[PDB]
Amino acid sequence: ADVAGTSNRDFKGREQRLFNSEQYNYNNSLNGEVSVWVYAYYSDGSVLVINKNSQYKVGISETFKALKEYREGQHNDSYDEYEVNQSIYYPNGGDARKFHSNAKPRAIQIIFSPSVNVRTIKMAKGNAVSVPDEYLQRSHPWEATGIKYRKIKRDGEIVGYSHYFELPHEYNSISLAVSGVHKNPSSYNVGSAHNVMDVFQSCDLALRFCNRYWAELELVNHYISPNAYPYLDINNHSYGVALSNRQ
Amino acid sequence: ADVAGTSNRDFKGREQRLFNSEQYNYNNSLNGEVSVWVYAYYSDGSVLVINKNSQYKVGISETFKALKEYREGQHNDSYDEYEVNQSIYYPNGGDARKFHSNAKPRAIQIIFSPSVNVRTIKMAKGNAVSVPDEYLQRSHPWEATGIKYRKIKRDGEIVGYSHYFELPHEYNSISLAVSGVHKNPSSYNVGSAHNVMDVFQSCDLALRFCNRYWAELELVNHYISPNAYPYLDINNHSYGVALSNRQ
Amino acid sequence: ETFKALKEYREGQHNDSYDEYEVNQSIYYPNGGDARKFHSNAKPRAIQIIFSPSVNVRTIKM
Amino acid sequence: ADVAGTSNRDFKGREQRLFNSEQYNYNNSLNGEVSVWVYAYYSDGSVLVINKNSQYKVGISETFKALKEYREGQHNDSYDEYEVNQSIYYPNGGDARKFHSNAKPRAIQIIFSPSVNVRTIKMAKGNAVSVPDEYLQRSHPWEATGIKYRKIKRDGEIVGYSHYFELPHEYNSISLAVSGVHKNPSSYNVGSAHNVMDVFQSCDLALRFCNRYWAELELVNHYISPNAYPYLDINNHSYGVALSNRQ
Ligand SMILES: Nc1ccn([C@@H]2O[C@H](COP(=O)(O)OP(=O)(O)OP(=O)(O)O)[C@@H](O)[C@H]2O)c(=O)n1
Ligand SMILES: Nc1ccn([C@@H]2O[C@H](COP(=O)(O)OP(=O)(O)OP(=O)(O)O)[C@@H](O)[C@H]2O)c(=O)n1
Ligand SMILES: Nc1ccn([C@@H]2O[C@H](COP(=O)(O)OP(=O)(O)OP(=O)(O)O)[C@@H](O)[C@H]2O)c(=O)n1
Ligand SMILES: Nc1ccn([C@@H]2O[C@H](COP(=O)(O)OP(=O)(O)OP(=O)(O)O)[C@@H](O)[C@H]2O)c(=O)n1
Ligand SMILES: [Cl-]
Ligand SMILES: [Cl-]
Ligand SMILES: [Cl-]
C-alpha cells in the first residue's frame, strides 16, 4: 500500500474527513435537527439548563416561577418562595421574609445549534406575569434578536450561536420564550401543504431535557463536552467541535 | 309485531348494530379522535400510563426523568435519585448509593387507537440526555416504526395497534416521543390552508391523562376496560371492543 | 435464613418497613395482606451458594 | 369399569386413601420432619408465632426481650421499653413510665407435630435474666413436661400435642426454650456414629419462621389452616387434618 499521510491513497484519512463533513452537512439538511438551550445562572454558581431538539423549528417557553432555582431532594424555602412570587407579581403583594430571593436567575444565556437560521430567531422576554411589553394591548408578542447573537467559533468554524444577558438588578424579574427555525436555503417550504403535517408531528416528536448542574465546570465537563454541544463560558471561552472538511 | 330475532323487522336489533357501526365509523372520520398511550412498566409491577387524545394528529414526548417511577404521597429517595440521574446522564457523573434505580422503566408499550394511519407513526427514542442517535449532528429526529406495530384484535376486528419493547439492560436509559396522524384516505389535506388553523387549535385542545396503577390487573380492570380502550397484556392477551357491524 | 431475613434491608435508610410487613402477609398467604405494591423490590432475584474447596461436594444439603 | 363406591376396583378411592396414609407415615419415619411452634399471646389480641421444622430433633430458644410484642413499621415505645426491661431484670432497676408493659405475653402455647415422641419433650422456662430455677448453681437446665401435653385430635386421630400456660400475673416474666426429639421406635440411634454428622447437618438445615398475626382468627385462617398445622384455640377447639387410613 502507499504510506499513511503521503498521497491521495490514504483512504482512512479521506473517510475520516468525509465522516466529519457528512455530520456537519446532515445537521444542516431539512432532515436534520435544530436545537436551542436556555441556561439560567444562579448566585450559588449552579446552572439550570433546558434543551429542546427538534426537526424544522424548535423553541422553549418558561414562566417566571419555572426559571427559579429548585434543588431536588433538598430544602427550598418553598412556603417563603410562594410569598416571594406574590411580591414579584405585584409590589408589596406578598409576606416573604427576604428582600431578594437567591433562587432568581442572575443571567441567561441562549444558545442555538449552527443549523438555525439566525434571522428566524424570536424571543418573548416577559415580565413576571408573562406579558411581553408592560401590557398585553400594546405587546408585540416577540422580538427578532438575531442581530445580537455572537458566533461561537472553533478553528474558524461556527459551532453555535449565543445571546447572553445579565439580570443583575432587583427589577430583572422575567418569563422567557425563545424560538428558532431550521435553515432552509431552498424554495421548498417545509410548512407548505405537502409537508405541513410532518411539521405538526415534529411538535410532538421534539425531545426535551432539563437539569440543574452545581457549577459551570460541571456543566462543561459533563453536559457540553460529552455531547459535542457548543458553549460559551463566563470567561468568553468557546467550546464545540469543528467538523466541516476536518479530520 | 314480528317476533324478535326471526325477521328483518327487528328494529331494536338493527339500531343496535347501526349504533355500534356509527361509533366505529365516526372515530375513523376526520371529525374523530386519534389517541396514543405510552405504558412504562416498573420492576415493582406498577405501570405508568400517559394518554393523549386529539383530532387530526396526536403525540407524547417525555424526558428520561419524567418516565421514572414516582409514587405520589410516598417516599421516593428523591435526593439519591437526583444523583442517579447525574450518573445516567454521564458515566460516573453522580454520587448515588445504588447501582440500578428501580424507578427506571423495565419495558415500554406504545399503543395507538385503530383510527391512526400506521404508516404515519414516528418515534424519537433518545438516550438519557434526549438525543435521538448518539449525537445531534448525525440524528434523524425520528424513526418510522409502523412496520413493527402488531394489530390488537377482537373478534377479527382491529381495535388498536401495539409496539412493545423491553428495557432489560443497565444501558437501556431513554427519553421518548411518539406521534401518529389520524387516517385520511381522502384527498382533502387537513393541514391545507383551508383547515390548518383548526389543526393549530387541535394542538391546544388535545386532552392529556396520566396515572400510575399498582398492577397490570388494576390497569386492565380500572383503566383499559371501563373506557373500551385496546390493550395487550404481558401474556399476549388482547383487550378491546369490536364494534364494526356488530351488536 | 427465613424468607423475611433474605429480603433487602438498607441500613440507615428508608425501607417501606410498614408496607413490607404487609407484603410478607401477602406472600405467606394469597391476598393475606394490604400492601401498596404488586412486587416488592426487596425480594431476591437470584441466589448463589458457594462452598470452599475443603467441602466434600457429596455431603452438601439444601 | 365397576361403578364408583361399590367394589374393591375403585382405584381412585384406594389411591386417595394410600396418598393420605403415606403422608402420615412419611412424617413419622426417620426421614420425616419434626416441628415445634411457640405461640405468645398479647393483651391486644395479637399472636406471635415462632415455628421450627427439622429432621431428628427440633427446638426454639427465646429471651425475655425477644418474646415481647414488636409491631413492625409502627411505634413501639422503644425507649420506655428498654427501661421496662431494666425494671424486670432487677426490681426498681429502671425508669419506665408504666407499671405493666402491654408488650408482655399473657399466655404461651407450645405445640408439637404428631411426629415428636412426647417423652422426649423438654422445656427451660427461665426468669427474665434466663436462669431456669432462681440461681444457676441449683438449676436443672430443663424440665420434662410431656405429661402435661394434651393430644390435639381430629376424627379420633392425634394431629399434634399442646401445652398451654397463662402468664396472668405481674411476676410472670419469662425466657423460654423448648425441645423435642422425632419418634424413633427402632433400635437404630440416629445420633450413633453412623449418622451423627447428619444430625449435625440437621441443626444447620432446620428452617425457622416467625410472624405476628393481628388476631387468633387471622392465625387460624391464614397460618394454621392453609398449612394443615395442628392448633388448639382459646375455646378449646381443635384444628388439623386427619390422614391415617382416611380419604
Ligand atoms: N413567609 C413565611 C412564613 C412562614 N413560613 C413557615 O416556616 C416554615 C418553614 O418554611 P419553608 O419556606 O416551607 O421552608 P422549608 O420547610 O425549610 O423548605 P422546604 O419547604 O423546601 O422543605 C413553614 O412551615 C412555613 O409555614 C415561611 O417559611 N415563610
Ligand atoms: N446519595 C445520597 C446522599 C445523601 N442522601 C441523604 O439521605 C436523606 C434521605 O434520602 P432521600 O434520597 O432524600 O430519601 P427520602 O427522604 O427517604 O425520600 P423522599 O425524599 O422521596 O421523601 C436525605 O436527607 C439526603 O440528604 C441520599 O439520600 N442520597
Ligand atoms: N400498606 C401501607 C399502609 C400504610 N402505610 C403508612 O405510610 C407511612 C410510611 O410507610 P412505611 O412503609 O413505614 O415507609 P417509610 O416510613 O418511608 O420507611 P421506613 O419505615 O423504613 O423508615 C407509615 O406511617 C405507614 O403507617 C404504608 O406504608 N403501607
Ligand atoms: N422512660 C422514658 C423516658 C423518656 N422517653 C422519651 O420519650 C420519647 C418517645 O418515647 P419512646 O419510648 O422512644 O416512644 P416512641 O418514639 O413513640 O416509639 P418508637 O421509639 O418505637 O418509634 C423518646 O424520645 C424518649 O427519649 C421515654 O419514652 N420513656
Ligand atoms: Cl434536504
Ligand atoms: Cl370526514
Ligand atoms: Cl425410617
Short mmCIF file of N, CA, C and O in Angstrom, two decimals, chain B residues 103-150:
data_model
loop_
_atom_site.label_atom_id
_atom_site.label_comp_id
_atom_site.label_asym_id
_atom_site.label_seq_id
_atom_site.Cartn_x
_atom_site.Cartn_y
_atom_site.Cartn_z
N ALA B 103 -36.59 2.71 39.93
CA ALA B 103 -37.54 3.65 39.35
C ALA B 103 -37.47 3.66 37.83
O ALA B 103 -38.30 4.30 37.19
N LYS B 104 -36.47 2.99 37.25
CA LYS B 104 -36.27 3.00 35.80
C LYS B 104 -37.25 2.03 35.15
O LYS B 104 -37.49 0.94 35.68
N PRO B 105 -37.85 2.42 34.03
CA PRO B 105 -38.79 1.52 33.35
C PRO B 105 -38.07 0.23 32.88
O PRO B 105 -36.90 0.29 32.46
N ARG B 106 -38.74 -0.92 33.00
CA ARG B 106 -38.24 -2.19 32.51
C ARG B 106 -38.74 -2.51 31.11
O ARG B 106 -38.23 -3.46 30.45
N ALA B 107 -39.75 -1.77 30.67
CA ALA B 107 -40.40 -2.03 29.37
C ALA B 107 -41.32 -0.87 29.01
O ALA B 107 -41.78 -0.14 29.87
N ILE B 108 -41.57 -0.72 27.72
CA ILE B 108 -42.48 0.31 27.22
C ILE B 108 -43.44 -0.41 26.30
O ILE B 108 -43.02 -1.33 25.56
N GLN B 109 -44.70 -0.01 26.34
CA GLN B 109 -45.63 -0.38 25.30
C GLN B 109 -46.27 0.90 24.77
O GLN B 109 -46.77 1.74 25.53
N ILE B 110 -46.26 1.02 23.46
CA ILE B 110 -46.95 2.11 22.80
C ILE B 110 -48.13 1.55 22.08
O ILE B 110 -47.98 0.64 21.26
N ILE B 111 -49.28 2.14 22.34
CA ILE B 111 -50.50 1.73 21.70
C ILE B 111 -51.19 2.92 21.05
O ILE B 111 -51.31 4.01 21.66
N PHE B 112 -51.59 2.71 19.79
CA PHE B 112 -52.44 3.65 19.12
C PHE B 112 -53.86 3.15 18.93
O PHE B 112 -54.08 1.97 18.72
N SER B 113 -54.80 4.08 18.90
CA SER B 113 -56.19 3.77 18.53
C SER B 113 -56.28 3.24 17.07
O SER B 113 -55.39 3.50 16.25
N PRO B 114 -57.37 2.53 16.74
CA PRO B 114 -57.46 1.99 15.40
C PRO B 114 -57.71 3.09 14.35
O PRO B 114 -57.68 2.81 13.16
N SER B 115 -57.96 4.33 14.80
CA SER B 115 -58.08 5.48 13.87
C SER B 115 -56.72 6.08 13.36
O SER B 115 -56.74 7.01 12.54
N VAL B 116 -55.57 5.58 13.82
CA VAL B 116 -54.29 6.11 13.34
C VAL B 116 -54.07 5.55 11.94
O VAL B 116 -54.62 4.52 11.62
N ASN B 117 -53.27 6.22 11.10
CA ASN B 117 -52.73 5.52 9.95
C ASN B 117 -51.34 5.00 10.39
O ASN B 117 -50.46 5.79 10.77
N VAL B 118 -51.15 3.68 10.36
CA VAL B 118 -49.90 3.06 10.90
C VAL B 118 -48.62 3.54 10.20
O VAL B 118 -47.52 3.61 10.78
N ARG B 119 -48.78 3.96 8.95
CA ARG B 119 -47.64 4.43 8.14
C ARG B 119 -47.18 5.83 8.52
O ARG B 119 -46.11 6.27 8.10
N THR B 120 -47.97 6.53 9.33
CA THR B 120 -47.59 7.86 9.77
C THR B 120 -46.88 7.88 11.13
O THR B 120 -46.44 8.94 11.58
N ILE B 121 -46.84 6.75 11.81
CA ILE B 121 -46.28 6.66 13.18
C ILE B 121 -44.79 6.96 13.17
O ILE B 121 -44.06 6.48 12.31
N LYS B 122 -44.35 7.75 14.13
CA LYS B 122 -42.97 8.15 14.22
C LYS B 122 -42.60 8.07 15.68
O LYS B 122 -43.42 8.34 16.54
N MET B 123 -41.35 7.73 15.93
CA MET B 123 -40.87 7.60 17.28
C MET B 123 -39.47 8.17 17.36
O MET B 123 -38.66 7.90 16.50
N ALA B 124 -39.25 8.99 18.38
CA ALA B 124 -37.94 9.51 18.75
C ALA B 124 -37.59 8.88 20.12
O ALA B 124 -37.97 9.40 21.17
N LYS B 125 -36.84 7.78 20.09
CA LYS B 125 -36.35 7.13 21.31
C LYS B 125 -34.93 7.63 21.51
O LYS B 125 -34.02 7.17 20.82
N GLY B 126 -34.74 8.62 22.38
CA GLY B 126 -33.43 9.18 22.61
C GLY B 126 -32.67 8.51 23.75
O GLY B 126 -33.21 7.63 24.43
N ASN B 127 -31.42 8.92 23.93
CA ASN B 127 -30.62 8.50 25.08
C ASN B 127 -31.06 9.38 26.26
O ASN B 127 -32.01 10.16 26.12
N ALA B 128 -30.39 9.29 27.41
CA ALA B 128 -30.92 9.93 28.61
C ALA B 128 -30.80 11.45 28.61
O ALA B 128 -31.49 12.13 29.39
N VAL B 129 -29.98 12.01 27.70
CA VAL B 129 -29.90 13.47 27.55
C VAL B 129 -30.74 13.96 26.33
O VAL B 129 -30.59 15.11 25.89
N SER B 130 -31.59 13.09 25.81
CA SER B 130 -32.65 13.47 24.82
C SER B 130 -32.07 13.79 23.44
O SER B 130 -32.42 14.80 22.80
N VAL B 131 -31.20 12.88 23.01
CA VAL B 131 -30.57 12.91 21.71
C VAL B 131 -30.96 11.60 21.01
O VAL B 131 -30.61 10.50 21.47
N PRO B 132 -31.66 11.71 19.87
CA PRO B 132 -32.15 10.51 19.17
C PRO B 132 -31.09 9.50 18.76
O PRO B 132 -31.35 8.27 18.84
N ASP B 133 -29.91 9.95 18.33
CA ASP B 133 -28.95 8.97 17.77
C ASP B 133 -27.49 9.30 18.07
O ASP B 133 -26.73 9.69 17.17
N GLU B 134 -27.09 9.16 19.32
CA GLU B 134 -25.67 9.34 19.74
C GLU B 134 -25.23 10.81 19.86
O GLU B 134 -24.75 11.25 20.93
N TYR B 135 -25.34 11.55 18.74
CA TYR B 135 -25.03 12.97 18.71
C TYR B 135 -26.07 13.66 17.82
O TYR B 135 -26.47 13.11 16.80
N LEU B 136 -26.47 14.88 18.20
CA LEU B 136 -27.40 15.68 17.38
C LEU B 136 -27.00 15.85 15.90
O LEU B 136 -27.85 15.76 15.03
N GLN B 137 -25.70 16.10 15.63
CA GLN B 137 -25.21 16.36 14.25
C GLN B 137 -25.60 15.22 13.29
O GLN B 137 -25.91 15.47 12.13
N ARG B 138 -25.60 13.98 13.77
CA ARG B 138 -25.99 12.87 12.89
C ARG B 138 -27.36 12.26 13.17
O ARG B 138 -27.64 11.15 12.70
N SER B 139 -28.20 12.96 13.93
CA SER B 139 -29.50 12.38 14.31
C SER B 139 -30.58 12.71 13.29
O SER B 139 -30.84 13.89 13.06
N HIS B 140 -31.20 11.70 12.67
CA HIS B 140 -32.54 11.91 12.10
C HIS B 140 -33.47 12.02 13.27
O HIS B 140 -33.38 11.23 14.20
N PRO B 141 -34.39 12.99 13.26
CA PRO B 141 -35.11 13.21 14.54
C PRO B 141 -36.23 12.21 14.86
O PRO B 141 -36.93 12.37 15.85
N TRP B 142 -36.37 11.16 14.07
CA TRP B 142 -37.37 10.14 14.37
C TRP B 142 -37.06 8.92 13.56
O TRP B 142 -36.23 8.97 12.63
N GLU B 143 -37.74 7.82 13.93
CA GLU B 143 -37.81 6.62 13.10
C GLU B 143 -39.31 6.33 12.79
O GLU B 143 -40.17 6.47 13.67
N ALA B 144 -39.59 5.91 11.56
CA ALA B 144 -40.93 5.43 11.20
C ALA B 144 -41.06 3.94 11.54
O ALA B 144 -40.61 3.08 10.77
N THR B 145 -41.65 3.63 12.68
CA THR B 145 -41.67 2.26 13.18
C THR B 145 -43.01 1.48 12.96
O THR B 145 -43.22 0.46 13.58
N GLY B 146 -43.87 1.97 12.07
CA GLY B 146 -45.19 1.35 11.80
C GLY B 146 -45.14 -0.12 11.50
O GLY B 146 -46.02 -0.87 11.94
N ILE B 147 -44.09 -0.54 10.75
CA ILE B 147 -43.89 -1.96 10.41
C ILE B 147 -43.80 -2.91 11.64
O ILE B 147 -44.07 -4.14 11.52
N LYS B 148 -43.46 -2.37 12.81
CA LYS B 148 -43.36 -3.20 14.00
C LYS B 148 -44.63 -3.31 14.81
O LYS B 148 -44.68 -4.10 15.79
N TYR B 149 -45.64 -2.51 14.47
CA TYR B 149 -46.86 -2.50 15.27
C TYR B 149 -47.69 -3.72 14.94
O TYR B 149 -47.95 -4.02 13.78
N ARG B 150 -48.12 -4.40 15.99
CA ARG B 150 -48.97 -5.56 15.86
C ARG B 150 -50.41 -5.06 16.00
O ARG B 150 -50.69 -4.13 16.76
#
